[PDB]
Amino acid sequence: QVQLVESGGGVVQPGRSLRLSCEASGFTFSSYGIHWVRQAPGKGLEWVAVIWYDGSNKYYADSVKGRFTISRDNSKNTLYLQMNSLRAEDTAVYYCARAGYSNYGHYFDYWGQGTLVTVSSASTKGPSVFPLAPSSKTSGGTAALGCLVKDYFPEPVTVSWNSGALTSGVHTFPAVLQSSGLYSLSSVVTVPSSSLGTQTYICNVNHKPSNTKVDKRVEP
Amino acid sequence: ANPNANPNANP
Amino acid sequence: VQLXXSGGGXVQXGXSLXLSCXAXXXXXXXXXXXWXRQXPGXXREXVXXXXXXXXXXXXXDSXXGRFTXSXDXXXXXXXLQXXXLXXXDXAXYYCXXXXXXXXXXXXXXWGXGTXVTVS
Amino acid sequence: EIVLTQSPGTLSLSPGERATLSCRASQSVSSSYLAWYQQKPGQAPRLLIYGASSRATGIPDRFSGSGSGTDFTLTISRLEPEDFAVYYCQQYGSSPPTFGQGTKVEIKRTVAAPSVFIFPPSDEQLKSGTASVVCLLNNFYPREAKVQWKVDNALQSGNSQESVTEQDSKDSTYSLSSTLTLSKADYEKHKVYACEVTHQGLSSPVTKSFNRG
């Protein structure tokens, strides 16, 4: 059971610093070198740093050289990554990965869950919920309605329908980062058109960071 | 001091 | 850019057919070629599409396993092999060219269609 | 610095079919040191093949690695439902380890045309100074689709964002939402708002529209 657990992620302003942690277990931590690998939103994987098993050598990637510092503590089975003068392109999910068996080379045989580092100047803001009213009345077979969760930061929001009773046909889209720096998504659901004038449709939006709860009624 | 060397013990 | 179907006719349930869609005015090797059909009174249903060689073929739910679409880029022609025909397949079968190289289904040019009747 | 190119971009296959992914390096990878990773949306990557051909611990036999020099190949003999994900190839024969852009293997199903819905901006949002017009494409396959906005029959560009769901776990479909963001001033200058959708499973473009007011 080789597991690596990351921590320390969160929101950080551009230019400021942030310290990540990686607590290991299930293997002899002092006999293996550990890496850091990051993955930008929607992009691919990029290697960041590496540290020897004894902490002697520490090599970095050119994108982060002179700004990031990798260190370890074999007594506590913990890896660190001190990130200084953070930039927008540093926003990514950071995984700590164990080094693999090789004569020369860095491949990653065991990864961690990863921690999200968001480099942004936005403040933690609650969402504004607006109804996506259907055009159907009866009109036809299946109508579609939904909620527009707009201008929140950071991720995520959780969206339920009718306090969880309505799950069939619910589509919640991945959030998109707007040009304002805030996130926005939509949650839609398909219902029979014959039930638009009888049933009540309420979307429940919950944003844990800003501790906001919005209940919006969606009516034709 | 090879940057591409394996960073584990005696492999 | 002109399209012309052929190979249609009348066969009874269980028979087989091989429709062909010839093209002129443009080389169709870089474009996807779709097959459609319009039953009596119903909507023009999607049947199958043959994207560029290597990009695979896609079929409608009602025709999966029975129909096969294929290309012949040297002869500028695509085919539709119809197996295990049923009386519900009676329709005029049209072929259309997807003018979008990225497969968004922009059907600019159509053929005049060939009748396939199964009684 | 070795750059890795993966082909194809997206591979559409059915369960039980044979999958072959290509990894092309700009320089020769020394000692055939190429690894393959599997990654599902929202999850961490995991190791499948190391050393171009040696298989990682706990990996099924259907996964197979081959290749040397500049061209490599990952092969899945019989595709299983849990094998549809993004696959990355990584080389470790140079000073900085480098990854490919990733190949996505996608479940292939029969073509389904999108059901198009359009939603006007709510009256509550119109009081804030911005208008959001939402066009909804629901349960379509394949993934390729086009959404063009028309405000008073004028082609809009640069003021819309598209979000797409992952391939649904039940019916292997996609859903897409195009959101046109306008200011209250620009929104009240025009009347006809419409999104025109084209899909390979639609004989004609489907257009939904409304008049402001």
Which amino acid belongs to residue B10? N
State the nearest Cα–Cα gap between B10 and chain A, in angstroms.
Answer: 9
The verdict on domain A3-119 having CATH code 2.60.40.10 is yes
Which amino acid belongs to residue A5? V
In Å, what is the CA distance from A114 to each residue of A38, A92, C52, C99? 9, 10, 39, 43
CB contact under 8 A, B6 and A33: yes
List the helix and strand counts (H, then E) for chain D. 2, 18
Q: How far apart are alpha carbons D9 and D71 in whole angstroms?
A: 16
In which residue ranges of chain A is CATH 2.60.40.10 found? 3-119, 128-218
CB contact under 8 A, A59 and B9: no
Q: Pick B8's closest partner by Cβ from A31, A57, A59.
A: A31
Q: Which residues of D148-157 are buried (b: 16+ CB within 10 A; e: fewer)?
A: bbbbeeeebe
For chain A, the first-to-last Cα distance in angstroms comes to 53
User: Three-state SS for B5?
Assistant: coil
In Å, what is the CA distance from C29 to each residue of A201, C52, C59, D200? 50, 7, 19, 17
Q: How many CB pairs under 8 A join A and D?
A: 124
Q: How many domains does chain C have?
A: 1
In units of Å, what resolution does this entry have? 2.9
Q: What residues in A contact D93, CB-CB < 8 Å?
A: 105
User: Three-state SS for D171?
Assistant: coil
Q: Yes or no: say if A22 and A76 are a contact pair by the CB < 8 Å rule.
A: no
Largest CA-CA distance found in chain B, in angstroms, rounded: 17
- Burial of A147 per CB tally in 10 Å (0-12, 13-18, 19+): buried
| Interface subset of A 52-111, CB within 8 angstroms of B | 52-54, 57, 59, 99, 101-106
Give residue limits of the domains in chain D: 1-109, 110-212
DSSP A180: T
Residues 6+ apart with CB under 8 A from D170: none
Question: Which range of residues forms the domain containing residue C66?
Answer: 1-119
User: Three-state SS for D184?
Assistant: helix
Q: Looking at the complex, does the CB of residue B11 fall below 8 Å from at least one CB of chain D?
A: no
Chains with ≥3 Cβ pairs under 8 A against B? A, D
Do B and C touch, 3+ Cβ pairs within 8 Å? The answer is no
Task: Nearest chain A residue to D181 by CA: give it.
Answer: A178
Q: How far apart are alpha carbons D165 and D141 in whole angstroms?
A: 12
Which CATH number is associated with domain A128-218? 2.60.40.10
State the nearest Cα–Cα gap between A217 and chain D, in angstroms.
Answer: 12
Q: Yes or no: say if D2 and D25 are a contact pair by the CB < 8 Å rule.
A: yes
- DSSP string for residues in C18-78: EEEEEEESS--TTSEEEEEEE-TTS-EEEEEEE-STTS-EEEBGGGTTTEEEEEETTTTEE
- Burial of A198 per CB tally in 10 Å (0-12, 13-18, 19+): exposed
In Å, what is the CA distance from D191 to each residue of D153, D159, D211? 10, 17, 5
